[PDB]
Every structure is written in structure tokens, then in C-alpha cells.
Amino acid sequence: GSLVCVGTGLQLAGQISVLSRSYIEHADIVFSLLPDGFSQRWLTKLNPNVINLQQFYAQNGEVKNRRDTYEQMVNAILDAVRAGKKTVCALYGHPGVFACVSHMAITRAKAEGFSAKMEPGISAEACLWADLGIDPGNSGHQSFEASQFMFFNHVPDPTTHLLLWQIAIAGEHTLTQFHTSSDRLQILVEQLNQWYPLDHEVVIYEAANLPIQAPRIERLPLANLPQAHLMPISTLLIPPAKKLEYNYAILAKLGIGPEDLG
């Protein structure tokens, strides 16, 4: 038995790798975590032996730590591997970006002597750059999980494009809820205010999951965030707020200046 984790991207059907699609096709069994039922139909057609990992999420409003959900997912995957099945894990987007299930399964698989690898895919971040015509290189890029940004010590660079993933549960410390409160979001605003003014335009981005669907690109002042309608798939883009200051110190050691910059 072996393990290959792949991504299906965001968009239905067309945004998966050619190779990644082939992996699903030839798999003995597929463990899926997909955005919707259209994506789940497409997969089943591609390979009928599919187990939907979605089931391991809290059901009927029960209190359940997501850590436990993930552990169960990982274990279900390994169960198939151990049994001797050429197993494929298909996650939406990139399987190893802001997703721990694939990294944990692979890690455990290797330690048990099974072949395991990860095939890169197209993520929400990849979609963002394209949808808002931004090149992350222009002024650099930064990503954090929204809650971690609040719970731990992170200092952003205000000259770069900043992203806060899982903004919908920003400050939800229990990991048993699906969303956070406006109060939490307000604390975030006040925290962000260390670097970004209140009227600083930010963007609520949501990549489309269907071909007939347009992406959500909602611009608003930072202060309005707490009142905004957020979804589990929402990502927060905080565009630069500051001018690039010349590292005169380094240019000097380079023996050059701005005027010499090609």
C-alpha cells in the first residue's frame, strides 16, 4: 500500500493537474474533501471507490475539537494504506497548503514504512494573484492563519501583500465553532491598527468553485470588517499601507544608490 495526496484546485474539474487527475483515476481508493456536490459528482465519475472525509466533521451541532476530526481523517487514510491499497487523498486546492491532514498522513505513512508523497496543486492563494491581477513579487507577500496571528506574536511587513486565512473563525480558540463573533473581529481590527489605519481598504476574496461563478472581491475599510458577511472560504487580503524606504545602509555597502537602480 502507498499514499499520494493531490489537490483538485478550486474550480470544478478543470483546475486539477493532468497527472493528479490520472492518480485519482488509477487509485484503488480515494479519500475526498471537496467544496461541494458538483465536485463530489465529478470525482465519483472519475473513480467510484470514494470515501468522503467530510463525514468526520462535527455532525448535528455536536461539540467536537477539529483536532479530533483531523486525527480521524488521517487514521481512515492510513487504514486503507495499511490494508495494502494504492490510496489517494484528494483535497481541494493544494493538498498541503493550510491543510494538516495530508502532511500528517504522509508523515505517519513514512514512519510506518509506506511510500507517501504530495503532488502540488492550485491553491486559493494562486487564484487570488490571478483574480486581482497581483504579482506577489511586486512588493512581496505574507500569509498567516487569522487566529494564529491573534494568539501568537506575528509582526507583518506593511509594504507587502498580507493575507489572513480562515478569517471567518478569527479568534475562535475552542476549535469547536464554525465561525467567530463581531467582537473577535473588532479585536483583530484594533490589533491590525498597529500597522494599518482604520480606513485602510482591505479585500474579502473568495475564489469561485464553479465555472459559471464569478469570484467575490469585496473592498471595504478595515473598520467595517466586523460587520462584514464572511464564509469559511473567505480570505482577507490586506494590501500594503506603507512606502518602501531605501535600505540606504545596504545600497552603500553595494556602493550604489537609487539612481543606479536599473
Binding site: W42, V101, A146, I169, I212
Partner: protein, 59 residues
Amino acid sequence: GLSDFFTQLGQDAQLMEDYKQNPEAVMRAHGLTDEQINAVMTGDMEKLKTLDVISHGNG
């Protein structure tokens, strides 16, 4: 019917470029009802379906 079309449209760049030129025409020709087309044109993903967090930051 509805699902089959979306699957194809997502994969087939020909059809995609056909849909961009004339969404209603392409949709009507693929058997989509009025309600389905209406939902698409108003972006009501909710209805269309009728007719995602895999990590955390608690260390």
C-alpha cells in the same frame, strides 16, 4: 443535466470561450431551465446546488 454541463464547461476551454460569448445561448442549448439560468445570472450558488477548514492556529 446541470452537473454534467458544469463538469464539461470547467474542463473544455472551447465550451468555456463559447459560454463567455453567449452564456444564455450556451446554457439553453445544454438543457438548463429558466430557474437554473436565472440562478446563474444572479449568482445564487445556494439555489443552484438545491436545483472547508482543514487546519488551525492554536499551535
